[PDB]
Structure formats: C-alpha cells, structure tokens
Amino acid sequence: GFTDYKVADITLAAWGRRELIIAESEMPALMGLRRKYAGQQPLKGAKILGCIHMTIQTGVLIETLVALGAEVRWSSCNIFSTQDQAAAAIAAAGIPVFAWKGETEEEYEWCIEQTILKDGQPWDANMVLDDGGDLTEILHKKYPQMLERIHGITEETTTGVHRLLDMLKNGTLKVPAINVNDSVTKSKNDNKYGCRHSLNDAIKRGTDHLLSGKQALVIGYGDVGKGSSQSLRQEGMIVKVAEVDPICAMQACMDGFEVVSPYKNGINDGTEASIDAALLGKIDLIVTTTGNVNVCDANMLKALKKRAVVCNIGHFDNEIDTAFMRKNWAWEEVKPQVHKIHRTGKDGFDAHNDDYLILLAEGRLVNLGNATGHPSRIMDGSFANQVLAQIHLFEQKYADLPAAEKAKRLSVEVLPKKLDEEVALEMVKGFGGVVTQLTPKQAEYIGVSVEGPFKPDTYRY
Amino acid sequence: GFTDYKVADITLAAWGRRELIIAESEMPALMGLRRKYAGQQPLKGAKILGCIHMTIQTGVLIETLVALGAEVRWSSCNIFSTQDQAAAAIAAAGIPVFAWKGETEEEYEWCIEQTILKDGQPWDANMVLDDGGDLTEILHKKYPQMLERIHGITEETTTGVHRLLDMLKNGTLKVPAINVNDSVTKSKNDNKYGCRHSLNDAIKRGTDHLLSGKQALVIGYGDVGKGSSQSLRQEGMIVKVAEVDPICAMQACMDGFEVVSPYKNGINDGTEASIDAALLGKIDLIVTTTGNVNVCDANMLKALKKRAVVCNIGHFDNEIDTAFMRKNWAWEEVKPQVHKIHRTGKDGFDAHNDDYLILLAEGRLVNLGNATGHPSRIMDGSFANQVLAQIHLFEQKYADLPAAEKAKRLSVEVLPKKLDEEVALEMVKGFGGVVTQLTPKQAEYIGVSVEGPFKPDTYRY
Amino acid sequence: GFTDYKVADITLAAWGRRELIIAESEMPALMGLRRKYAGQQPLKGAKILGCIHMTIQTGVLIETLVALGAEVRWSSCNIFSTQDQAAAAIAAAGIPVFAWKGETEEEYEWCIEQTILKDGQPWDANMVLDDGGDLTEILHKKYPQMLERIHGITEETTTGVHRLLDMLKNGTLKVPAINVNDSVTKSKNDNKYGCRHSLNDAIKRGTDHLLSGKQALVIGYGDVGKGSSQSLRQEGMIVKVAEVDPICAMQACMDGFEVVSPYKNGINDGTEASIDAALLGKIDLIVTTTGNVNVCDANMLKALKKRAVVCNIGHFDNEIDTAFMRKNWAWEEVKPQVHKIHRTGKDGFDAHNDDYLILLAEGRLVNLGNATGHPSRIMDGSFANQVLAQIHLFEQKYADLPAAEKAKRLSVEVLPKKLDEEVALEMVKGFGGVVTQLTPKQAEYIGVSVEGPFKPDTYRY
Ligand SMILES: NC(=O)c1ccc[n+]([C@@H]2O[C@H](COP(=O)([O-])OP(=O)(O)OC[C@H]3O[C@@H](n4cnc5c(N)ncnc54)[C@H](O)[C@@H]3O)[C@@H](O)[C@H]2O)c1
Ligand SMILES: NC(=O)c1ccc[n+]([C@@H]2O[C@H](COP(=O)([O-])OP(=O)(O)OC[C@H]3O[C@@H](n4cnc5c(N)ncnc54)[C@H](O)[C@@H]3O)[C@@H](O)[C@H]2O)c1
Ligand SMILES: NC(=O)c1ccc[n+]([C@@H]2O[C@H](COP(=O)([O-])OP(=O)(O)OC[C@H]3O[C@@H](n4cnc5c(N)ncnc54)[C@H](O)[C@@H]3O)[C@@H](O)[C@H]2O)c1
Ligand SMILES: CN(Cc1cnn(C)c1)C(=O)C1CCCCC1
Ligand SMILES: CN(Cc1cnn(C)c1)C(=O)C1CCCCC1
Ligand SMILES: Nc1ncnc2[nH]cnc12
Ligand SMILES: Nc1ncnc2[nH]cnc12
Ligand SMILES: Nc1ncnc2[nH]cnc12
Ligand SMILES: [K+]
Ligand SMILES: [K+]
Ligand SMILES: [K+]
C-alpha cells in the first residue's frame, strides 16, 4: 500500500528494473561502494532530499544511498530529463519520487515541494543532494528552519557550485557543501566525455539529421564545450568555436577548430549590425555550452541559416533567447521536445514554409531532453563521488554543533585526491585496464607514495 | 474511402507528414528530380511493386515516383525497419502500403503479397523496386506470369545484386535489372557513410552503453564494414577488424585497425578449439557486416565476454547463428528489439544472472531495427539513383519488345557515370559546396570534357 | 673496376646499405617475391631500363629485379627525389645508376640518356620500368628502333598511365604496358596512404611550421588528394577541398571537409575579379594533387595570405604557375628546396619583407623533394606489383611474336586481381594481421573460391 510518489506510469517499473540491473553492471565504482559500505551502514539515519535528473543512472545512485542506510525523497532537476521507466522502478521499490518527462514549470516546483513536505509537514530531512541549486535555493528561501537540521549539501554541477559560492560570499549559505563537480572523475569525465557521448546522440534522436559535412557553431569551450565540439567533430561536422576565455580559445585552436565570434570583432553591443550575418548565415547547428545568459541571442537567431538546428546543453534554458522566439515566432511541434520555429510571424504558419529553425528540448538540456543523458559507465564516476560526499558530510554532523562551531566549519570543499584516484581506479578496471604499480625507488624518485596521491593538488590533468 | 493498406496506426500520419516535409529539405537530389521531370511525367503508366524499408526516406522516394506519374504498391523489406509514422503518412496519402514495425515472418510475406495482389487478383504491375531480392524471388518463384508484363527491376543493395547475378548466370532471370547499389553515390555513400552515422546511433538507442574505451570486433571491411568500423572508432572504441579479403584487410591496417581472426591461424574448422578464446573473451561488441552466412557462429557466441553486445548490420539475420541461441539459451526481452540471451541454459533464467549477451534487433539490420537507418541526406543519393533507374527501365519497355530484342536486352547493368556525377553534384550543392569548372585547356590536358565524365569507368574513387 | 654510374658521393654507400637492410625488413611482399623466384631466375636475360625516384625503396626494388636475374640501368624520374645514399649503395653494388638529389633539367635528361646508352650507343634493352612516362617518351621520340626489341613497359603512376593511354589511342604506343598504378595494393595504398604519411612529413622538414589550427586548401580529392587532406586534417589543420569531379567532392563533404573553389561560383575566367580573394587571403597552406595544369595559377598566388606555404604533390611542377613567379617575383633560398618568394617585385628583396610565399621543392613533388617520399612498408605493395608486372611482360616476349599476335596483345592492362590479393596478403602479414579463411560453404554462399579472387573486377573497395 505504497502511495507516496508521483510518476507518469507505474507499470513501466519492470522495464525500469531490467535497465537498472544492466546499468549496475556498467557502474563498478558505485557498485563497489555499495558492496564495501553495505554492512557498515554509514548512512543509517540520513534523510536525503535529492534533486537530480531522474534517469536510470540516478536510480542506481538512489538505491546505493538506500543500501547504505539512507531514507530519501527524490525529484528531478529538469522538466524533460526524467526517464519514466526509471522513476517507475524507484516508486515501485517503495521510494518517494516525484518526477516525469515533460513536467510544466508549476509541476516542477510541486515535485520539489513534495520531497520537502511529508503529509503536508516538513520532512525531518538532514542531508541534501542537488544538481543545479534549485532545491538548495528553495530551502534557503522558503524553508530556512529545515536547514537548522541539515548536515550539508552535495552539489553535482558547475552552475550549482557557482550559486553556492555566491551564497558563501554573501554570508547567506546556512550549511556546508561539497563541490562534487570539481573531482577529476566528475568534471573531466562527466562534463567533457559525457557530452561527447550524448550530444550527437540527442541531435540524431530529435532530427535524424546527417551531421557529416555540415557547419556547427559551439558557444563555449569549457569542459562541456570541449566534449560537445568533439561530439560533433567526430561525426565529421565542420566545427567553429566561440569563447570569451582566451585560454579556452587557445585550446580550441590547438585542437583543430576555427575560433569565431557571432559578433563583429567580438563586440556585442546589442544591435543587429554587430552580428556577423555572413558567418551565422552558414551555420547548420548551434549549441550553447556556457552556463551564462543569452549567449545565443535574438539577433543571432534572426541571422541563422534557414532550417538550422538550435540547442543548449548548459544547465539552464536562458542560454538561448527562447523568450524572444515565444513572443515573435510561431511554434510547430514536430514531436515531443522538437519544435520548428517559423520566423515568418507569430500568428500561424505555412506548413511548407522554408524559413524556420529547429529547436530541441525547448532549449533545455538537450542531451537529457532528447536522449538519455550521459551513459551509466560515465555517471559511475560522478555518482561514486556523490556517495562519498554524502557519507563525509553526514558523518561530520555539522547541524549538531553549537552556534560557535558551525561558523568555523561553514565552507564549500572538494573531496581529497586520494578518493578521486580510488574512484578512477575502479573505472579503469571496468574497462579492463591494468594500472602499473611504482617500485619503491620509482616512488622516491618522483616524491610520491606507492599508493598515491600521485599528483599535487595544483595538477590540472 | 481509401482502405487498400495496412499499417500500425493511421493516426500517426500527421506526424509522419511533418517529418516528410523536413526530409524533403534534406534530399535535394531527389527533390531536384521532382522539378526537372514533373512536367514530362516520365513514369506515367508505370505500376511499381516496391519492397524496401518503409522509412521517412522511402516516403520521399515513394512520393517522388508518384509525382513523376507512377502508381505504386509498397511493402517493407525487413520486419523491424518500418517507421510507423512514415507508413501512416503514405497510406493517408491514398497510396497502398502494407508495413509496420515489428512484423512476424508470416506477416512479412503477407505484406509483400498484398502489394502483388489487388482485389484478390494479380495487380497489372509493370515495374519492380527491390531491396534484398525478396520481392524479386517471390515473383519469379510464385508469380512468373506477372513477369511477362514487367519491364525491369531496380535493386538497391549488394545482397540483392548478388541474387540477381546468380539468377542471370542460371538463365533464371526473366526481366532486365539495374544494379542501383554500385553507383558511387550509392555504394560509397549509403553503404559506408550511412552505416558510420547509424550504427553507433542504433547501439546507443538500444543499450545507452558508453562505447569509448571498450573493445569492438567488426566482422568484414567492405563498404558497410568500413563505415561500421569508423562509426565505432570515432566514438573512441578500440576496434579490431576481421576479413577474408586480404585487400580489404590491408585497407583496415592502413586505416589504423588491428586485423584479427576469431579463429587460430584464421582457420575456421568448426571446432571450439579453433576459437581464439582470449580474443573473444575481451570483446565488448561484435558487429557483422559481411552479407555472408554464420560469420558470428555458435562457438564465437559461447566464447564472447560476458555481457557483450551482438548485432548485425548486413542485410539478413543469418550472419549471426541466432538459431543456435533460440535452441539453447533463454531470451529475456529488455525492450522491443533488445534481448538478453542467458547462456546458463534454455529452461528459464535468473533475473540477476551475469552470464548473458545482449542481442539487438534479433540479429536483423541493427541501424534500421534499433534506430532509423541512414539519414535523409545520405538516402538522397541512393533514391535519386532509384528514380533514375526506374525511369530508364520503364521507358525501355522490355515487356513490349520482340523476343529477339528481349534476349539482347536481358542483363544486369549500372547507371552511366554521367548520371552518378549529376546526383553527386546536387548532393555537394546541398552541403553548400562549390565545384570548380575546368578551363578548356585543363580539360584537354587531362583528356576529359568540361562537362565530364571526369574519370574512366575503371576508376575506383 | 666498375665505373658505369654517376652519383653525388660514392662514399655514402655504406650508409645506404645499412638503410637498405632495414628497408628489406619493412618490405615483406617484395622480399617474399625475392625468396620465391630467386631459384627460378624468371628475369634471366631481361635488360630493364628503369626510371623512378632513386630512393632507398627503389633500391630494394632494383636489387629484387637483379636477384631474379635481370640487368638494369637506372635513373631517377625527378630532379629532387633521389636519396644520395641509396644511389651510392646501388652503384657500389656494380649496378648502373645515374641519379643525385638536385639535378638540373639538363642533368636530368643526361641521366636518362646514360641508361639508354652504353658506351655511347643504345644498350640492348628489352624491358622498361617507368614512373611518369619521361623515359617512355624519350624512347618513342628519339630511340624508336630500340622499342622493336622491348617486350613491355611497367608504369608506376597515374600521370604515366594517362600518357600511355593517349599513345595507345593515337596508335603511337609501340609495346604493351602494365598499369601498375591501378592495382588496389598500389593506387589505394601508395597514392592515398603514402601521401598521408609523407605530405605533413615534408612540410615539417621544410618549414617546421605548426599545422594545428591553421587553414589549408587542398586542390584535388583523388587518391593523392584524399591522402593529402588526411595528412593535414590529422595534424589539426582546418582543411578545405577543391574539385572539378562532383563525385570526389561528395566524398570530401562526407569525409568532413568544406568544399570550396578558388574562383567565385567555380568559374575561372582568367581575371583577378573571378578569384575568391576573401577565401584565399585566409589560406596558410595550399597543396596541389591533380596531375592537371595550372590548378594554382598566378591570380591565386597573388591573392594568397602573406607567408602562406605553397607546394605540389602531383607528378609534375606545372600544377603551380611557378614560371609566373620566376618572371615577376624575387626568390630567396632559405635552404635547399625551400624558397621564399617575395611579391614586392623582381629586383631584389628586403630581408625583413613580410609579403612573401614559401615554395617547397620549387613546385616539384614535395614528399620526395623535401622528405623521403612514401615509407618502405607502403612502397612494398607498389614494388611487388612492379616485379610481377616485369615478370609477366618479359615472359610474354611480345617483341618476338608474329605481328598478328602482337596486335592482340598491344594494350595497357592491370595485373589480375588474384595477384593483387597475394600482394595484399603479404602486407597484412607484415603488420601481424590474420586474414580469415572462408569455409567451403561460406565461399559457396558468396560465389567465390576459398582461394579468391574475393571480389568481381568491378569492385571499387
Ligand atoms: N548537459 C549536461 O549533461 C551537463 C554536464 C555538465 C555540466 N553541464 C552544465 O553546462 C554548463 C557548462 O559547464 P562547464 O563545466 O563546461 O563549465 P565551464 O566553466 O568549464 O565552461 C563554460 C565556458 O563558457 C565560456 N563562456 C562564457 N560566456 C560565454 C559567451 N558569452 N560566449 C562564449 N563562451 C562563453 C567560458 O569562458 C567557459 O570556458 C553549466 O551550466 C553546467 O552546469 C551540463
Ligand atoms: N544496414 C544497412 O544500412 C546496409 C546498407 C548497405 C548494405 N547492407 C548490407 O550489408 C552487407 C555487406 O554490404 P557491402 O556493400 O559492405 O558488401 P561488400 O562486398 O562491399 O563487403 C562485405 C565484406 O565482407 C567480407 N567477408 C565475407 N565473408 C567474411 C567472413 N567470413 N569473415 C570476414 N569478412 C568476411 C568480404 O570480404 C567483403 O569485403 C550486404 O548484406 C548488404 O546488402 C546493409
Ligand atoms: N607524390 C607522390 O608520391 C604521388 C603518388 C601517386 C601519384 N602521384 C601523382 O599525383 C597526381 C594525382 O594522382 P591521383 O592518383 O590522385 O589521380 P586522381 O585522378 O585520382 O586525382 C586527381 C584529381 O584531381 C582532380 N582535379 C583535376 N583538375 C582539377 C582542378 N583544376 N581543380 C581541382 N581538382 C582538380 C580530378 O577530378 C581528380 O579527382 C598524378 O600526377 C600522380 O601521378 C604522386
Ligand atoms: C537530369 N538533370 C539535368 C542535367 C544535369 N546535367 N545534365 C547534363 C543534365 C538534373 O539536373 C538532375 C540530376 C540528378 C538529380 C537532380 C537533378
Ligand atoms: C578445414 N577445412 C575447411 C572446412 C570445411 N568445413 N569447415 C567447417 C571448414 C577443410 O576443408 C579440410 C577438412 C578435412 C581435410 C580436407 C580439407
Ligand atoms: N544520465 C544522467 N543521469 C543523471 N544526471 C545526468 N547528468 C548528465 N547525464 C545524466
Ligand atoms: N533510412 C533508410 N530508408 C530506406 N532504406 C534504407 N537503407 C538504410 N537506411 C535506409
Ligand atoms: N619512397 C619512394 N620511392 C620511390 N618512388 C616513390 N614514389 C613515392 N614515394 C616513393
Ligand atoms: K543514459
Ligand atoms: K533516418
Ligand atoms: K621513404
């Protein structure tokens, strides 16, 4: 008689369980943590509010936390990223989850509130796992009393970590956090290689367009932009890259990309005349990867080649001025998460009009919106870090300190390199790779221990 | 009141129609044939039996043949390759089509017969379009009288051309045929680049497996094997290649792949002792590409690494010994066209057994079975050749020739290089490419006309 | 007391012998023929005039022909392509060779004549091995009497075959020929992969320029152009391709290249107004691969980006209008085969002028001019074909047949596919590859012999 959930179709649970069993074989770091810590139950007593894409991969994470003793209440951190069969499997296992593919904004907020509230009253939560900072923001803004009992936050992604550091500098952060994003086995695995796998995957599922021989513009060349550019280049696209960071621009050049700006001489003054109309007129596909605001703006959208695809793989949809397109242009749904946007007018469209753009996932995270996000074996690294971070913060029991002691432990930290390496070793073994062991004299020669850590904390990999 | 069809769901037509309109903008050579020939109606009076994958791309082909004056009756050439919304769009257009995704073998044969028979009698067909030779075989073997009225066959694929050539060698081919496969804008575009696009696409949709860093074995290195190996290598797989043709094997070496055999010394004597158990026990993914029989045999299946993915992108499912797997091992459906094959035995399976293989599309063509096959811009090339082939054979009027002229005309031929080049030029313009025109002195220097053809018929590209 | 040679420096012979011994281990097809046929001496009595780049690789070719019983007299087919240590090692072995790096045009002609003449009068030659057709032309124009005793010509390269075909068509070809170029183990090995290896090699040796991130324009996308484009793209260049053949252009598009023309809309009208000055002013490197005339013309050279590198990897230097650059612009030698060409005028130059181009090998074959051409393991394929072609034509004894039989054998033909496959098998084995053997049933299924040939003669690979 379990009813504390809300999913699209509970009967998809058996299908979801089949895929969870497969995914478990693809996630050895996470399943190794489950085996190593199951008997010790290091999360016994933890009550975790979780807000992250309700995919099959997140399901393995959820059941790993539960296997270690935790109770959880879960929601997705995006309206399009849930895999309904994963949510169904988690609900059928008796775990409160509120998540389905294609939520409205109102339903998105309701789902988070259903994790926060149990039977109309605040749940006695004491841990937070977030991806992007929406749950974190709601707790600080609307439920500050609940944070008095919460031992910490473990934050998944770059945008969320940015919001956390903003609150820390403004003195508004109420509990300590661990930056899961900046582990090497997260940032340089998930953010880069994950988008390499899943960006062309989403574009093919949404459009079935040939990419070889076509022109792409990738806005940004951080980790997500690096992986995105590779996702397209390996398919044979001619890829151009835009950046505001000269060091990232240098890497793009050395990686074999032409570096261009959508604006003449890189200067974005807000006018149509600043747009490089000749450049945008040749682009078949534009992808935003920045985590910034309005990096594919209304003047760029007006100037893009007819029938160009437009998508975003950064965390929030405001990378693209989709508001401008809702106000001025007529939307034709091809299928879910795929819209033709007719630049001929707002009121109606000719079904055979040739002047349209194709928008994927209404400008929300395209890899999760139009495909299934990152594959299990990549998320294995990110989610082993999440499990380790949850254990660390829960065992430190920040909320039980006196007021004076909380002030001294309020911080945003990363996991130590030794744990990063141990996650990486399990990932390598999952590939069948064999790591060499240093001899004692070789370890002394480079000044490390035989068991690591093998690099100083300044090393960039 | 049109009722002459059978599809999964006629209400998918509007969705199919939206995707057809997108596909037309992706297929400029085919769409260019509509404009150049619409006024002349070169297929007026043609009644075409067509048997080929009922995809969106085949939709554009079908409606091109109809726009040039033809009547058609269509079926798919594979039980899993139909896109149900394409079939719905075609039927809703008043065009007879008998095709749905996931047919049984009996329904497959039934669908082809519904194209052959109209109102219980043979249709007065006079043209054939085939992909694989199944329709051609059924006509020769079961409706030879209909071939008295048929002017020719245009065959799409390598396996179908081989069957035509065997019939010709045996004196058992009743109408002339055009080998559409061996146009360069078909074989060196569809067969190679199409599989490059669509193989990893299908594997991702089926399993969502990370491919980077894993081991693949591609059986075959002809056109499909070349494109398949690239599909996987560009994703970061470590790809090994098997071949019986030493020329193709040389190409794989020079392309940067290790060439291996599943058998010790390359000698396939049919025994378990001949299997290189070490090699097979390291392979995460095996893909057959040969058009041959039993190239992923039972002994290889027994020796594959636990949880390896097995699929076939050749035309017929007998490239993998799936019959052996049906007889001996338990099949667990993950989802449509994805099965776990449990090697623990045939009488049931443990849901948490680790000793299984993952078979895609039940060994049927994986790109069409687990995804959508080749993209529109690639199929543009194949299907422009098909339309040109249909025009040439229909206007030749073989069925109306005297018996002496019939005997001189009974052959299997390819399209002339000029037509191949003309298709290629429209493909290049679709990419925005600009071809240079020879000066008269340059044309004289290399001994070609400024208008081409630019290569001798022996040229291999 | 052997003096019948002329080389740069005989004392380089020991060095040349060391490298020949290494190259022998890299040339298993060639050495396999040596071991297989040395007992039979099938070239006993053959007297071969040979004209092909006097490299280490040609050294192994020459000594294989001698090992099989032939006498030869040798010259290079390019003024810059000889490796002086290879020539010295051949002369030290008592083999007539006339070749050194850096010949004048007069010396080049004199060297070919020294092979034709022994003691001031025509040698009793009876076979010809040629690369590019210069020796073949001199025999037909200046020594036609010698051709009445010559049993055949074995021609290495595409341009040479073109000239042979023109002569056959005109009725001026006096002896049969084997087209060695169009063996798959030659054209699709040497012409493509050889240039992939040696083009970026020669550019680095000549300029030491970083190639990553810069813009290249490759004129042509045949076998040489395909390999040259890959040579640059794999280094990270942004590569654009020009073509007159829409089929080759299609391949360049599908291979991930942007296809452009130096002329607006591809129309070369002889005026500067037709030059796409905006495109050419972005190009850092241009490479001609066509075998055509003036594909990098004067107006192009004027519009190139300052400090661009210009080079040719086709057979003859007229692909670039270097005559224009000699007449109008000041040449500054950087080092042998590397010249700065100052576009500021003809009479001298400022040492610090910024407006110059860099010309490699004075527009002669750049891979052989500025580096060492193709590696031994690739030339293995080409030269194994040469040996088999020499054996076949010599044993046919064309010159001694009745003219009624001569008329039936006066042709330009390629080797049989079976021998093409045997050469490929030995190359694959050189890599450690293992070719799989068809079972009798599999061979039956696809219609071949277990021993091959495995493809019809129309197969393009
Ligand atoms: N979709 C996914 O699966 C996924 C995975 C990881 C992260 N993310 C999200 O993607 C975003 C980027 O993450 P990241 O790790 O790459 O961050 P990052 O800081 O490494 O990279 C962002 C880059 O954008 C550049 N940039 C900023 N403004 C720009 C502008 N106007 N024009 C061009 N370039 C500009 C920055 O210089 C920077 O290099 C974040 O929102 C993150 O949360 C998404
Ligand atoms: N799925 C698709 O979209 C698609 C597209 C085109 C063709 N096809 C089909 O794919 C198959 C192959 O087509 P193709 O054009 O590449 O033919 P191909 O002749 O060009 O190449 C097939 C290759 O398989 C090799 N081979 C044969 N038996 C072998 C064995 N026992 N082990 C290893 N290698 C072996 C042959 O040497 C040959 O090089 C045919 O059935 C064709 O109809 C499928
Ligand atoms: N340097 C080497 O090691 C090496 C090796 C092999 C061959 N070659 C020589 O290289 C040349 C090319 O050989 P190939 O086998 O590639 O011949 P090919 O016929 O395969 O390719 C030449 C290509 O140039 C294209 N072309 C012709 N005129 C053009 C123009 N004005 N603009 C653009 N493209 C144009 C043609 O369409 C053709 O595709 C020949 O001279 C050959 O003898 C050199
Ligand atoms: C047949 N024609 C006219 C033509 C072009 N060249 N020549 C000598 C005649 C076309 O344009 C087709 C070519 C293939 C598909 C699109 C349009
Ligand atoms: C090993 N092979 C090839 C073959 C035949 N069948 N299979 C499955 C493989 C043979 O033909 C031998 C068999 C015994 C002695 C003579 C020749
Ligand atoms: N598959 C996935 N599950 C959860 N979060 C993700 N972020 C990116 N891919 C993801
Ligand atoms: N999309 C497609 N439609 C028809 N035939 C195909 N063969 C391969 N892909 C195809
Ligand atoms: N190394 C080499 N030797 C002889 N001829 C060649 N042609 C291209 N490379 C060569
Ligand atoms: K996934
Ligand atoms: K498709
Ligand atoms: K060399």
The DSSP result for C26-70, as a single string, is: T-HHHHHHHHHHTTT-TTTT-EEEEES---HHHHHHHHHHHHTT-
Q: In what order do the strands lie in the sheet with A153-155?
A: A97-98, A71-75, A47-51, A127-130, A153-155, A177-179, A412-413
Say if the Cβ atoms of B184 and C247 lie within 8 Å. Answer: yes
Distance between CA atoms of C261 and C340, rounded to whole angstroms? 25
3-state secondary structure at position B7: coil
Contact assessment for residue A116 and residue A138, using Cβ atoms and an 8 Å cutoff: yes
Rounded Cα distance between A27 and A22, Å, is 9
Q: For residue B246, give the nearest of C249, C259, C428 by CB distance.
A: C428
Give me C272's structure tokens: 């500067």
> Is the CB of residue C312 less than 8 Å from the CB of residue C319?
yes
Bridge partners of C296? C320
Annotated binding site of C: 55, 131, 156-159, 186, 190-191, 220-225, 243, 292, 313-315, 367
Q: What is the number of alpha carbons within 13 Å of residue C424 lying toward its C-beta? A: 31
Residues with Cβ < 8 Å from C241, sequence gap 6 or more? C217, C218, C220, C221, C225, C229, C249, C252, C257, C258, C259, C260
Helix (H, G, I), strand (E, B) or coil at B38: helix
Tell me the CATH number of domain C193-373, given options 3.40.50.720, 2.60.40.10, 3.50.50.60, 3.40.50.620.
Answer: 3.40.50.720
Total CB pairs under 8 A between chain A and C: 39
Q: Which atom of ligand 3 is nearest to the CA of C291?
A: 41
Q: For C150-164, what is the HEC assignment?
A: CCCEEECCHHHHHHH
DSSP state of C190: I
Distance A367 CA to ligand 6 centre (A): 9
Full DSSP string of A70-116: -EEEEE-SSSS---HHHHHHHHHTT--EE--TT--HHHHHHHHHHHH
Residue labelled with tokens 């012998």: C17
Specify whether the CB–CB gap between A127 and A152 falls below 8 A.
Answer: yes
**CA C348 centroid distance within chain:** 35
Hey, do A2-192+374-433 and A193-373 end up sharing a CATH topology, with the first three levels equal? yes
DSSP state of A296: B
Peptide bond into C453 cis (omega under 30): yes
Residue A297 to residues A225, A292, A322, B348, C27: CA-CA distances in angstroms?
Answer: 18, 12, 9, 57, 59
d(CA B283, CA B310): 10
Angle, helix B417-430 to helix B376-396, in steps of 10 degrees: 150
CB pairs under 8 A between B and C: 198
What one-character-per-residue DSSP string does A161-210 give? HHHHHHHHHTT---S-EEE-TTSHHHIIIIIIIIHHHHHHHHHHHHH---
Q: Are residues C237 and A256 in contact, defined by beta-carbon separation less than 8 angstroms?
A: yes
List, in sequence order, every beta strand (DSSP E) within B94-214: 97-98, 117-118, 121-122, 127-130, 153-155, 177-179
Closest CA to A64 of A94, A91, A43: A43
Cα angle: A282, vertex A210, C288; to 5 degrees: 65
Q: Is the dihedral of CA A329, A334, A335, A339 positive or negative?
A: negative
Domain C2-192+374-433: give its CATH architecture: 3-Layer(aba) Sandwich (3.40)
How remote is the CA of residue C182 from the centroid of ligand 11, in Å?
Answer: 21
Contact between chains at B197 and A204 (C-beta distance less than 8 A):
yes
SS3 C127: strand
For residues A22-61, b (16+ Cβ closer than 10 Å) or e, as one string? bbbebbbbbbbbbeebeeeebbeebbbbbbbbbbbbbbbb
Of B141, B46, B56, which Cα lies nearest the Cα of B99? B56
Nearest CA in chain C to B193: C254
- The string over B198-234, giving b where at least 16 C-beta atoms fall within 10 Å of a residue's C-beta and e elsewhere, is bbbbbbbbbbbbbbbbbbbbbbbbbbbbbbbbbbbbb
Q: Are B309 and B261 in contact (CB under 8 A)?
A: no
In chain A, whose CA is at the least distance from the CA of B208? A375
Question: Quick check: CB of B384 below 6 Å from ligand 4?
Answer: yes
For testing contact with chain C, the best of A215, A251, A253, A276 (most C CBs within 10 A): A253
How far apart CA A398 and CA A418 sit, in angstroms, is: 23
Run of H or E including B420: helix B417-430
Q: Who contacts C385 (Cβ-Cβ below 8 Å, separation ≥6)? A: C180, C183, C185, C186, C415, C419, C420, C423
Subunits adjacent to chain B (3 or more Cβ pairs under 8 Å): A, C
Which residues of B are marked as active site? 53, 76, 81, 131, 156, 181, 186, 190-191, 195, 315, 374, 382, 386
The residues whose Cβ lies within 5 A of ligand 9, an ion, are A 372-373; B 208
Nearest-CA neighbor of C278 among C289, C258, C262, C266? Answer: C262
Instruction: Give A205's contacts (C-beta < 8 A, 6+ positions apart).
Output: A370, A371, B205
Gyration radius of chain B's alpha carbons: 23
List, in order, residues 6 or more apart from A54 with CB less than 8 Å away: A74, A75, A76, A81, A82, A83, A86, A87, A90, A97, A99
Q: How far is B69 from B40, CA to CA, in rounded Å?
A: 9
Q: Do A56 and B208 touch (CB under 8 A)?
A: yes
Please identify among residues 393-452 of chain C the ones whose CB lies closer than 8 Å to any CB of chain B.
Answer: 420-422, 424-425, 427-428, 431-439, 441-442, 445-447, 452
| Ligand with an atom nearest the CA of residue C365 | 3
Count the residues in chain B.
461
Q: How far apart are CA A90 and CA B390, in angstroms?
A: 55
Which DSSP string do the residues of A140-154 spell out, in sequence order?
A: HHH-HHHHTT---EE
A395-404 CB contacts, 8 Å cutoff, 24+ apart: A395/A42, A396/A151, A396/A152, A396/A176, A397/A151, A398/A151, A398/A152, A398/A175, A398/A176, A399/A126, A399/A148, A399/A149, A399/A150, A399/A151, A399/A175, A400/A151
Inter-chain CB proximity C435 and B261 less than 8 Å: yes
Angle among Cα A37, A38, A39 to the nearest 5 degrees reads 95
The Cα–Cα gap between B292 and C446 comes to: 6
Task: Give the atom of ligand 7 at the shortest distance from the alpha carbon of B375.
Answer: 1
Query: Do B394 and B152 touch, CB atoms closer than 8 A?
Result: yes
Domain ranges of chain A: 2-192+374-433, 193-373
Q: What residue type is assigned to position B168 of the chain?
A: L
Closest Cα partner for B247 from A331, A58, C420, A132?
A: C420
Residue B339 in contact with residue B310, Cβ under 8 Å?
Answer: no
Residue length of chain C? 461
Indicate yes or no: CB of C238 within 8 angstroms of CB of A258.
yes
Distance between Cα B85 and ligand 7 center (Å) = 15
CB B439 within 8 A of CB B202: no
Task: Give whole-number Cα distances, A74 to A96, A179, B134, in Å.
Answer: 6, 20, 52
**Token output for B113:** 């017969």
Nearest-Cα distance to chain B for A402, in Å, is 47
Beta pairing partners, C330: C342
Q: Spell out a b/e string for B87-96, using b for 16 or more CB atoms within 10 Å of the CB, else e.
A: bbbbbbbebb
Is the preceding omega at residue A453 within 30 degrees of 0, hence cis?
A: yes
Q: Is-contact B157 B131, C-beta < 8 A?
A: yes
* Nearest chain A Cα distance for residue B209, angstroms: 6
Q: What distance in Å separates the CA atoms of residue B204 and residue B388, rounded to the nearest whole number?
A: 35
Pair of tokens at residue A238: 């001619």
What is the phi/psi pair of residue B220, to 5°? 110, 145
DSSP state of B40: T
Residue C346: CB partners within 8 Å, gap ≥ 6?
A: C327, C328, C329, C330
What does the block give as tokens for B90? 């075609």
Closest Cβ opposite residue C213 in set A215, A237, A254: A254
Q: Which two tokens stand for residue C374?
A: 């193709």
User: What is the C-alpha to C-alpha distance for residues C398 and C72, in angstroms, rounded to an integer?
Assistant: 19
Other Cβ atoms within 10 Å of C250 Cβ, number: 33
C234 in active site: no
- Best residue among B244, B268, B275 to mutate for probing ligand 5's pocket (most ligand atoms within 8 Å of CB) is B268
Q: DSSP assignment of A17-52, as one string?
A: HHHHHHHHHT-HHHHHHHHHHTTT-TTTT-EEEEES
The residue type at C298: A
3-state helix, strand, coil split of chain A in percent (to 5) is 45, 15, 40
> Nearest CA to B442 among C291, C163, C274, C262?
C291
Interface check for C254 against chain A (CB to CB < 8 A): the answer is yes
A201 CB near a chain B CB, below 8 Å? yes
Contact A165, A181 (CB under 8 A): no
Per the CB < 8 A criterion, the answer to whether A146 and A126 are in contact is no
Experimental method: X-ray
User: Which one, of C278, C196, C279, lies nearest residue C242 by Cα?
Assistant: C279
